Design a protein around this motif. Structure first.
Motif, PDB file in Angstrom:
ATOM      1  N   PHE A  38      -8.938   6.714  -2.572  1.00  0.00           N
ATOM      2  CA  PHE A  38      -9.692   6.601  -3.816  1.00  0.00           C
ATOM      3  C   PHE A  38     -10.926   5.719  -3.659  1.00  0.00           C
ATOM      4  O   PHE A  38     -11.924   5.934  -4.355  1.00  0.00           O
ATOM      5  N   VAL A  39     -10.903   4.752  -2.741  1.00  0.00           N
ATOM      6  CA  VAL A  39     -12.119   3.991  -2.454  1.00  0.00           C
ATOM      7  C   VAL A  39     -13.166   4.901  -1.818  1.00  0.00           C
ATOM      8  O   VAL A  39     -14.344   4.909  -2.215  1.00  0.00           O
ATOM      9  N   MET A  40     -12.750   5.671  -0.811  1.00  0.00           N
ATOM     10  CA  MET A  40     -13.615   6.694  -0.237  1.00  0.00           C
ATOM     11  C   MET A  40     -14.240   7.541  -1.337  1.00  0.00           C
ATOM     12  O   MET A  40     -15.464   7.707  -1.394  1.00  0.00           O
ATOM     13  N   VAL A  97      -3.327   5.997  -0.178  1.00  0.00           N
ATOM     14  CA  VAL A  97      -3.882   6.531  -1.421  1.00  0.00           C
ATOM     15  C   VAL A  97      -5.022   5.648  -1.913  1.00  0.00           C
ATOM     16  O   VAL A  97      -6.044   6.140  -2.415  1.00  0.00           O
ATOM     17  N   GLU A  98      -4.868   4.329  -1.772  1.00  0.00           N
ATOM     18  CA  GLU A  98      -5.909   3.406  -2.208  1.00  0.00           C
ATOM     19  C   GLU A  98      -7.183   3.595  -1.396  1.00  0.00           C
ATOM     20  O   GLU A  98      -8.285   3.662  -1.957  1.00  0.00           O
ATOM     21  N   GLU A  99      -7.053   3.662  -0.068  1.00  0.00           N
ATOM     22  CA  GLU A  99      -8.214   3.937   0.771  1.00  0.00           C
ATOM     23  C   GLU A  99      -8.868   5.251   0.372  1.00  0.00           C
ATOM     24  O   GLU A  99     -10.099   5.355   0.322  1.00  0.00           O
ATOM     25  N   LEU A 150     -13.340  11.595   7.191  1.00  0.00           N
ATOM     26  CA  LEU A 150     -14.403  12.263   6.454  1.00  0.00           C
ATOM     27  C   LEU A 150     -15.671  12.311   7.299  1.00  0.00           C
ATOM     28  O   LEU A 150     -16.014  11.338   7.980  1.00  0.00           O
ATOM     29  N   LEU A 155       0.831  -1.194   0.000  1.00  0.00           N
ATOM     30  CA  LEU A 155       0.000   0.000   0.000  1.00  0.00           C
ATOM     31  C   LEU A 155       0.870   1.250   0.000  1.00  0.00           C
ATOM     32  O   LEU A 155       2.028   1.232   0.424  1.00  0.00           O
ATOM     33  N   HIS A 156       0.290   2.347  -0.481  1.00  0.00           N
ATOM     34  CA  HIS A 156       0.989   3.630  -0.572  1.00  0.00           C
ATOM     35  C   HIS A 156       0.538   4.498   0.599  1.00  0.00           C
ATOM     36  O   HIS A 156      -0.473   5.199   0.530  1.00  0.00           O
ATOM     37  N   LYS A 157       1.313   4.456   1.680  1.00  0.00           N
ATOM     38  CA  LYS A 157       0.940   5.127   2.915  1.00  0.00           C
ATOM     39  C   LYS A 157       0.969   6.642   2.754  1.00  0.00           C
ATOM     40  O   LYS A 157       1.787   7.201   2.018  1.00  0.00           O
ATOM     41  N   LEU A 158       0.063   7.306   3.470  1.00  0.00           N
ATOM     42  CA  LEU A 158      -0.016   8.758   3.497  1.00  0.00           C
ATOM     43  C   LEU A 158       0.833   9.315   4.634  1.00  0.00           C
ATOM     44  O   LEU A 158       1.188   8.613   5.582  1.00  0.00           O
ATOM     45  N   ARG A 164     -14.665   6.826  -4.415  1.00  0.00           N
ATOM     46  CA  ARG A 164     -15.604   5.996  -5.160  1.00  0.00           C
ATOM     47  C   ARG A 164     -16.979   6.024  -4.512  1.00  0.00           C
ATOM     48  O   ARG A 164     -17.996   6.204  -5.190  1.00  0.00           O
ATOM     49  N   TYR A 165     -17.029   5.852  -3.193  1.00  0.00           N
ATOM     50  CA  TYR A 165     -18.317   5.744  -2.514  1.00  0.00           C
ATOM     51  C   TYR A 165     -18.830   7.071  -1.961  1.00  0.00           C
ATOM     52  O   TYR A 165     -19.874   7.084  -1.301  1.00  0.00           O
ATOM     53  N   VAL A 205      -4.426  15.110   0.743  1.00  0.00           N
ATOM     54  CA  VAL A 205      -3.830  13.830   1.127  1.00  0.00           C
ATOM     55  C   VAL A 205      -2.391  13.738   0.633  1.00  0.00           C
ATOM     56  O   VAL A 205      -1.524  13.177   1.314  1.00  0.00           O
ATOM     57  N   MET A 261     -15.589   7.751   7.378  1.00  0.00           N
ATOM     58  CA  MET A 261     -14.509   6.833   7.050  1.00  0.00           C
ATOM     59  C   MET A 261     -13.166   7.509   7.277  1.00  0.00           C
ATOM     60  O   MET A 261     -13.008   8.711   7.039  1.00  0.00           O
TER      61      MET A 261
END
Lengths: 40, 167
Positions: free
Chosen positions: B42-44, B38-40, B12, B3-6, B46-47, B108, B33
């Motif tokens: 972009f999922v955020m 970065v992945e988390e 949110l 994962l790509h950590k922040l 998304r939803y 972010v 959430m």
């Protein structure tokens, strides 16, 4: 000197993000967000 | 799991008249959430609901973890907010949604201030006529940092007012 990303780097990593999802625990909390109602 | 950590976690929140707590105003806020990568993030995204379809009286808050989107928060007590008033089957993302996404990615990605932290959070507020974007900082006395935030925020956006306000 800290963990930094560029916009293009983030948009590249979004492709990886596309492989991950949310369970019902975290996903139910998005239900509070409300869509605007229609105007007849 | 590579994962790509922040640099920081981010939470949110969403509020609206339906979440309005008449007894205790603070509880009107609903944390949704927390994202650490970065992945988390972009999922955020998304939803999340787009602003073009969001309710007339709603607010997204996006603040560092352990930092509430309120002045009473020790992170925001001394600081203030720099805000701007933007204007209003499948369709293309609106410029408003695009600017919202750009500012979130800058938050972010830590290029909202390219140099303790100076930016504590951001707030999008859907209003009747306007749409208020706001960047909540921590030190209201830092003039150079506020100018750097001004240029940055103007860059990441392309959608009528710009005002800094100490809390």
């Amino acid at each position: 000197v800290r963990t930094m990303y560029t916009r293009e780097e983030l948009l590249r990593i979004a492709t990886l993000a596309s492989a991950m999802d949310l369970g019902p625990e975290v996903l139910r909390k998005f239900d509070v967000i409300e869509v605007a109602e229609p105007v007849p | 799991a590579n994962l790509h950590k922040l640099q920081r976690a981010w939470t949110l929140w969403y509020d609206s008249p339906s979440t309005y707590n008449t007894e205790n105003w603070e509880m009107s806020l609903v944390p949704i959430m927390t994202v650490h990568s970065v992945e988390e993030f972009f999922v955020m995204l998304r939803y999340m609901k787009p602003l073009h379809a969001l309710r007339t009286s709603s607010q997204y808050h996006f603040f560092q973890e352990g930092v509430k989107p309120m002045w009473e928060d020790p992170a925001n007590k001394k600081g203030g907010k720099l805000w701007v008033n933007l204007d209003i089957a499948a369709e293309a993302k609106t410029d408003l949604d695009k600017a919202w996404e750009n500012v979130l990615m800058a938050t972010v990605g830590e290029y909202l201030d390219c140099v303790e932290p100076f930016v504590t959070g951001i707030v999008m507020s859907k209003r009747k006529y306007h749409n208020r974007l706001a960047v909540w900082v921590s030190d209201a006395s830092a003039t150079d940092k506020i100018e750097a935030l001004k240029k940055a925020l103007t860059k990441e956006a392309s959608l009528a007012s710009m005002v800094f306000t100490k809390h």
